[PDB]
Each structure stands twice: as structure tokens, then as C-alpha cells.
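Bug #77: duplicate submission created two jobs. Keeping one. Sequence:
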Amino acid sequence: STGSATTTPIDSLDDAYITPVQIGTPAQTLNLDFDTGSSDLWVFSSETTASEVDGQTIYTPSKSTTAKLLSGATWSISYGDGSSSSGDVYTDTVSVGGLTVTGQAVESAKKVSSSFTEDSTIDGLLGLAFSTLNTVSPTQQKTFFDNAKASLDSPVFTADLGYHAPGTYNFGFIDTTAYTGSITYTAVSTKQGFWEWTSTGYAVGSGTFKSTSIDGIADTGTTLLYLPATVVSAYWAQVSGAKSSSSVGGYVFPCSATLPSFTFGVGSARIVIPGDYIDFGPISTGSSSCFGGIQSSAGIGINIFGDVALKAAFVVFNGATTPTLGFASK
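Kept job's structure:
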């Protein structure tokens, strides 16, 4: 089997991407944030505290003839941005782009933090990291990809995120029309539960490539590109007036600037992030200070190849017995 679904930016900045997902019988369609940096499929639901729902579409398990309470199971998750959610668990039928999994753990939110409430466009998350990170207790649950893997034509999914435009998540096949050149594959460590790999270096604009190993995660659920402070300083030094602002929370730059590109290495190959992808617009409405799309990871503990980087590539998440990542230009 295969599946193919369009993913759409939630706003004009590509702050996140939503993909429609069918849950239950009859289908209830919710727009979920596919997140290769976590491993829980959770949804706003009829059980979510009413004051914490503000425009999201909810899953109502009592209206699904295939929903079953997973007795005793609870979940609770906290994300790198400080947001969180928690609740109980049902199993139900879940379909993405024509690919159907029966018995998928659907984690029903009883509580969500303010950032989720405040984002009316995201009805939940669909985790695509390794199932060892799944938070369901006392019986850890498998991700949608893990449950589908054996049925797929090939044990892979691909992320093809658009810049200010829709893109595609495919399951079970590699669309050879969706990229240019060849796909370069690189090793993955699953030791932290992430799609963790080592970039071979970087360049700023037309500058010379610096060969240096940068360990980080391919994370579709993180908006920006978070890299070591040395790398980020080298980037922003090429932008007149750019500075790191403690009050704003990162590097800002004059909105009048033209940003240079940023290149990252994948083995001997190179992925080029155009400068425009690094512009996240005014820090507040009407400001001439703009927020940068490349930020320091120094306070995180891990480097994160978020959407800013991944949207410049066609990315293969290869879930073979030894997982690997592939990147192609497009």
C-alpha cells in the first residue's frame, strides 16, 4: 500500500504545516501537524476542557463506531517550545492520503497548553519519530508509520514541504518526479528516538564550504533551523545590522535586508536554503525588525533541522531495519 497527502502552511510565514487525517467511522477529518520530532498522535476532542478549545475541529470518539477506549492508558507530553498536552487514549481507524491503519492509538486531549488553544488551525499532532518516544502509559503505543510499515510497498515516508506553498507527505514510495538530481542517504542514530544524523558542514551565501560535523535531528514539527552558536554567528555576521536580542529571544535583522542563502552538507552533497526562506517577518506587527529563521541551539541541547532546512529539500525518512535519511534538491 501507499498514501499521499497534501500538507499546507498554516500562515503566511510557514510557521507550521497541516495535513488532513481521517479518524474513525464515519470519518472525522482533522488537520494535524505531522511531527518527525515526536511520537504521539494526539487530537483535540470532545474530552478537551471547553475553555481550552478555540476554533479547532475536535474528534468525538462516541460518534465513531470503530473507536475503543484503551482502558487505563494515559498520555502526557511536553515539547521543546514549552507547550504541552495530556489525556486518555482510544484506538480507532486512521487514514492518511488513502493509507489506512486499523487499531491506531489516538490520544484524546483532556488538557492542552495555551499555545495550542491559541492556534485554531492545528487540530492535533501526528508523531513520526521513533515509537520509543511515545508517551502512552502503562503500555507504550506505536506511531502511525510504525503501524503501517509492514503493509507499505517500501518502508519509507517522504516530506516535501513547500516554501509559502503546499507540499506533500508520501508513505510507502519515493516520487522520482518530486526532486532533481539524486538522493543522498546518510546514517541515522535512533538512540535518542529521533531522526538524528550528522551534517558534513555549511556555507554562508557564496562563501566557501566549512567541513565540520553537525549532529542534529530532522524535525518537521520545528519551524526554524537551530545550529551551534558559532555557525549562527557566522551567518548573521553577513547581514548588516543583524544582532542577537535577548528581549526578543534570538537573532533579528533589519526588515530592509536581503538575506544570504545558507548551505548544509549531506555527505558530499549540498542543500541550499535560499535567503528568503530565512525571513520570518516583523517581530511585532508594523516593526522594521524582522525575526531570523536560523537561530542558536545553545540553549536546547540539540541541533534541529526544522522546516527552514527541510523545505529546501526532498527528504526521505527510510524506516528499513537500519533507518537512514535521504536528501535531494528540488
